[PDB]
Amino acid sequence: GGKVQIINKKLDLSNVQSKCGSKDNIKHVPGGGSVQIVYKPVDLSKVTSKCGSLGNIHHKPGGGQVEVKSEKLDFKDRVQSKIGSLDNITHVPGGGNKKIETHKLTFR
Amino acid sequence: GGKVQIINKKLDLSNVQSKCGSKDNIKHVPGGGSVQIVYKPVDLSKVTSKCGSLGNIHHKPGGGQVEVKSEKLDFKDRVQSKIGSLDNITHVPGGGNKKIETHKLTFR
Amino acid sequence: GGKVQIINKKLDLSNVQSKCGSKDNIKHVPGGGSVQIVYKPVDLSKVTSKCGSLGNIHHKPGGGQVEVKSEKLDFKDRVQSKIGSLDNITHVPGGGNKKIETHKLTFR
Amino acid sequence: GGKVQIINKKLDLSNVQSKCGSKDNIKHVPGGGSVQIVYKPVDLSKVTSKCGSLGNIHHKPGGGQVEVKSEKLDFKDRVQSKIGSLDNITHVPGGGNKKIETHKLTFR
Amino acid sequence: GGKVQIINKKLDLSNVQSKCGSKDNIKHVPGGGSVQIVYKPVDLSKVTSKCGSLGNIHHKPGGGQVEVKSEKLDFKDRVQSKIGSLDNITHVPGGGNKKIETHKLTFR
Amino acid sequence: GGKVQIINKKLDLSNVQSKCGSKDNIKHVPGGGSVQIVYKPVDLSKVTSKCGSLGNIHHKPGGGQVEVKSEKLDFKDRVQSKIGSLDNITHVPGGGNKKIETHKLTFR
Amino acid sequence: GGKVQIINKKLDLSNVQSKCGSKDNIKHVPGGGSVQIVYKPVDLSKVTSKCGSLGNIHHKPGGGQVEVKSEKLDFKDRVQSKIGSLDNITHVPGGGNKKIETHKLTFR
Amino acid sequence: GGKVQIINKKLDLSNVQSKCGSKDNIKHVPGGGSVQIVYKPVDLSKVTSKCGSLGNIHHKPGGGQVEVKSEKLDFKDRVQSKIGSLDNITHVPGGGNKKIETHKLTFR
Amino acid sequence: GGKVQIINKKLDLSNVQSKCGSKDNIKHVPGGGSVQIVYKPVDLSKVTSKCGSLGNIHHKPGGGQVEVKSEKLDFKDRVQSKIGSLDNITHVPGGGNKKIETHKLTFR
Amino acid sequence: GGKVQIINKKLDLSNVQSKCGSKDNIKHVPGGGSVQIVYKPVDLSKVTSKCGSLGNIHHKPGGGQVEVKSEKLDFKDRVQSKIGSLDNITHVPGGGNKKIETHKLTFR
């Protein structure tokens, strides 16, 4: 018959801030003629502010409980592909350029 | 017969802030002639503010409960594809350029 | 019959800040004609502010509980692919350039 | 029947800050004609501020509990691929250059 | 029946700061025609500020508990690939250069 | 009574070309925030092709002619002005820059 | 009574070319925040192709002609001005720079 | 009564070329924050191709002609000015620089 | 009564070339923050190709002609000015530099 | 009554080339923060190709001609100015430098 006693008096808590930056995939692209791939971004982040909070309360003297919490996250991947291919490209951001060529020949 | 006693008096809690930035996939693109792919962004983020809160209360003395919480998340992937291909491209953001060619020949 | 006693009085807590920077994949790209790949960014970060908070309370004298918490995260990968290929490229950001050629020949 | 007694009085805690910098993958790229690959960034970072906080309270005299906490993280990788290939490239950021050639011949 | 007594009075704690720099993969690249690969950055860092905080409290006299905490992190890798290949490149950031050639011939 | 005799027979004249480049004042300016002044460009150029042509023929034996050809071109200039002034300028073509200031104070 | 006799037979003249480059004042300026002044460019150039041509023919035996050809070109200049002034300038083409200041104070 | 006789037969003249380069004042400037002044470029150049051509023919036996050809070109200049002034400048093309200041104070 | 006789037969003239390079004032400047002044470039150059050509023909026996050719070119200059002034400059093309200052104080 | 006889037969003239290099004032400057002045370049050059050509022909027996050719070129200069001044300059092309100062104080 044990006793748990938690007395809180005159508690003044303030300014508990938790901030995170932006997570943008493809943003602000004025360039062109490119290949930009973001392949499978997985986000399991956690931004948390706790201020004067309590957890779970479990008063179970002499009990035979079975508490099971399971969180199975599977990301098995079998990737046999062709990602991000770019060729036969002429890219001229400059001005006043003359006689630019790009030739490709292929025989099979 | 144990006793749990939690007394809270004169509690003044304020300013508990939790902020997160934007998560944009393809935003603000004035460039052109490109390939921009965001393939499968999975978001499991959590932005939480707790202020003077309590969890679950479980008063089960001498009990035989079976509490099971399961969260199965499956993302098995078999990708055999062709992602982000870009060729035979002339890209001229510059001004006053002359005689730009891009030739490709293929035989099979 | 043990006793746990936690007395808090005249508590003044303030300014608990937890900040993190931005996590952007492909941002602010005015260049072009490139290949930019972010392949599988996995984020399990945690930004946390705790201020005057308590954890879980478990008052179980003489109990036979079985508490199991499992978190299985699987990222098995079998990647046999072709990532980030770029050829047969002429890239002229300069101005006033003359007679630039890029030739490729292939026989199989 | 042991007794645990924690008395806190006249507690003045302030300014507990925890900050982290930005984690950006491909940011601020005005160059072009390149290959930029960020392959699998895994983030398990933790930014934490604790101020006047307590952990879990477990009052279990004479108990036979079995508390198991498991966190299995698997990242088995079998990568047999071709990452970051770039050839047959002419790259002229300079101005006023003349007669630049790049030739490639292949026989199989 | 032992007794644990922790009395705190007139506690004035302030200015507990913990800061870390930015962790950016590919940032601020005005150069071009290059190959830039960041292959698998794993981050398990921890930035922590504790100010007047307590750990877990375990009052279990004469108990037979089994507390097991396991954290298995697996990163087995079998990489047989071709990472970061760059050839047949002419790269002229200078100005006023004349007659630059780069030839490659291959027979198999 | 002198005699002037000019006999031309079997004359085959071809390919007499006279070309000049462009004379542009302010052309192809993607930059900004500048002061670009072209003050009084005077052009008296002459591009001429003559092929099998003859000049003036003057048959004046024993004459008292007065032939006067005058071409007076005056460009007297008295410039007491303020040309091309540019100040109190912040010019940031770069990206990701922080906290740039430009202050000017004047007392008369 | 003198005689001038010029006989031309079987004349085959070809390929008489006279070319000049471009004369551009302010061309191809992607830079900014500058002062660019071209003050009074005077062009009296002459690009000429003559092929099988003759000049003026003057048959004036015993004459008292007065032939006067005058070409007066005046460019008297009295410039007391302020040309090309640029100050109080911050110019940052670079990226990721921090805390750049430029202060000017003046008292008269 | 003298006689001038010029007989030309079987004349084959070809390939008479006269070329000159470009004369550009301010061209191809990607730099910025500068002062670039071209003050009074005077061009009296002459690019000439003559192929099988004759000059003026003057048959004036016993004449009293007065032939006067005058070409007066005046460029008297009295310049008392302030050309090309540039100060109080911070110029940072580099990246990642911190805390750059430029201060000017003046008292009169 | 003297006789001048010039007989030309079977004349084969070819390949008479006269070329000159470019005369550019301010060209190809990617640097910045500078003062670049080209003050009064006077060009009186002459690029000439003569191939099988004759000069002026003057058949004036016993004449009293007065032939005067005058070419007066005046460039009197009285320059009392301030050309090319540049101060109070911080110029950082390098990267990663810290705490650069440039201070100027003036009292009159 | 003297006789001048010039007979040319079977004349084969070829390959008469006269070339000159470029005369550029301020070209290809990637450096910055400098003072670059080209003050009054006067060009009276002459590039000439003569191939099978004749000069002026003057058949004036017993004449009293007065032939005067005058070419007056005046460049009197009175320069009392201040050309090319540059001070109070910090110039850091290097990277990773710390704490660079440049101070100037003036009293009059």
Q: How many C/G residue pairs have CB atoms within 8 Å?
A: 3
Task: Report resolution in angstroms.
Answer: 3.1
Strand intervals (E) in H41-81: 42-43, 46-51, 57-59, 66-74, 77-79
Nearest-angstrom CA–CA distance, I85 and J83:
7
Phi, psi of B15 (to 5 degrees): 55, 60
**Among all chains, which residue has been given the structure tokens 């923060």?**
J33
Contact H96 E30 (CB under 8 A): no
Nearest-angstrom CA–CA distance, E77 and E75:
6
Tokens at G89, concatenated: 């300038």
CA gyration radius, chain E: 30
Closest I-chain CA to E93: I30
Q: HEC states along D61-72? A: CCCCCEEEEEEE
What DSSP designation does G97 have? Answer: -
CA atoms within 13 A on the CB side of E36: 24
Do C9 and A9 meet the contact criterion of CB atoms below 8 Å apart? Answer: yes
User: What does the buried/exposed string (b/e) look like for B77-108 if buried means 16 or more CB atoms within 10 Å of the residue's CB?
Assistant: eebeeebbebeebbbbbbbbbeebebeeeeee
The alpha carbon of I66 is separated from its chain's Cα centroid by a whole number of angstroms, namely 34
Residue-level length of chain A: 108
Write out chain J residues lying below 8 Å of H55, CB-based: 56
The alpha carbon of J66 is separated from its chain's Cα centroid by a whole number of angstroms, namely 34
Paired strand residues for B7: A7
Closest I-chain CA to G23: I24
Pairing of β A82-91 and β B82-91:
parallel
Write out chain C residues lying below 8 Å of A41, CB-based: 25, 38, 40-41, 43
Which CA distances in Å does B26 have to A24, A87, C10, C25?
8, 23, 51, 11
Closest CA to E84 of E42, E39, E41: E39
Amino acid, single-letter form, for residue F91:
H
Which CA distances in Å does D78 have to C81, D39, F108?
11, 13, 75
Write out chain B residues lying below 8 Å of F95, CB-based: none
Contact E30 G96 (CB under 8 A): no
Q: How many CB atoms lie within 10 A of CB A95?
A: 26
Tell whether D94 lies on the interface with G, counting CB pairs under 8 A: no
From E63's Cα to the closest Cα of chain H, the distance in A is 59
Nearest-angstrom CA–CA distance, G50 and H51:
6
DSSP string, A42-107: EE--EEEEEES----EEE-TT---EEEEEEEEE--EEE-SEEEEEEEEEE--SSS-EEE--EEEEE
What DSSP designation does I62 have? Answer: T
Which CA distances in Å does A15 have to A18, B15, B38?
10, 5, 37
Indicate the burial class of J103 (C-beta count within 10 angstroms; 0-12, 13-18, 19 or more).
Answer: exposed
Tell whether J96 lies on the interface with H, counting CB pairs under 8 A: no
DSSP string, G45-87: -EEEEEES----EEE-TT---EEEEEEEEE--EEE-SEEEEEE
Do C40 and A39 meet the contact criterion of CB atoms below 8 Å apart? Answer: yes
Nearest-angstrom CA–CA distance, A94 and C98:
12
Tokens at E40, concatenated: 């698998």
**Among all chains, which residue has been given the structure tokens 């936690």?**
C6
Residue-level length of chain F: 108
From A33's Cα to the closest Cα of chain F, the distance in A is 20
List of residues 6+ apart from I10 with CB closer than 8 A: H9, H10, J9, J10, J11
Amino acid, single-letter form, for residue B82:
K
Write out chain I residues lying below 8 Å of G91, CB-based: 32-33
CA atoms within 13 A on the CB side of F100: 26
From C25's Cα to the closest Cα of chain G, the distance in A is 17
DSSP string, H4-41: EEEEEEEEEE--EEEE-----SEE-----S-EEEEE--
Q: How many CB atoms lie within 10 A of CB E10?
A: 9
Contact H93 J32 (CB under 8 A): yes
Closest CA to H43 of I59, G60, J43: J43
Closest A-chain CA to B48: A48
Nearest-angstrom CA–CA distance, H82 and H76:
19
Chains F and H touch (3+ CB pairs under 8 A): yes
Write out chain A residues lying below 8 Å of F28, CB-based: 95-96
How many helices, marked H, and strands, marked E, lie in chain B? 0, 12
Tokens at A96, concatenated: 């006043």
List of residues 6+ apart from G66 with CB closer than 8 A: F65, F66, F67, F68, H65, H66
Tell whether E76 lies on the interface with C, counting CB pairs under 8 A: no
Do D11 and C13 meet the contact criterion of CB atoms below 8 Å apart? Answer: yes
Closest E-chain CA to D86: E86
CA torsion I86-I92-I98-I103 (nearest 10°) is 0
Which CA distances in Å does G4 have to D14, D31, F5, G62, H8?
114, 73, 6, 16, 14
List of residues 6+ apart from G106 with CB closer than 8 A: F104, F105, F106, F107, H106
Tell whether G108 lies on the interface with A, counting CB pairs under 8 A: no
What DSSP designation does F27 have? Answer: E
Tokens at B58, concatenated: 């479980």
Write out chain E residues lying below 8 Å of H95, CB-based: 28, 30
Mutation for testing the I interface, residue in J34, J46, J66, J76 having most I CBs under 10 Å: J34
Do A21 and D22 meet the contact criterion of CB atoms below 8 Å apart? Answer: yes
Nearest-angstrom CA–CA distance, A58 and E53:
23
Closest CA to G38 of E69, E24, H41: H41
Contact I30 E95 (CB under 8 A): yes
Closest CA to F1 of J1, G54, G56, H62: H62
Nearest-angstrom CA–CA distance, J32 and J54:
53
Residue-level length of chain H: 108
Nearest-angstrom CA–CA distance, D79 and E79:
5
Paired strand residues for B66: A66
Strand intervals (E) in chain F: 3-13, 16-19, 26-27, 35-39, 42-43, 46-51, 57-59, 66-74, 77-79, 82-91, 98-100, 103-107
Contact J57 H93 (CB under 8 A): no
Do D64 and C63 meet the contact criterion of CB atoms below 8 Å apart? Answer: yes
Amino acid, single-letter form, for residue D68:
V
Tell whether E27 lies on the interface with H, counting CB pairs under 8 A: no
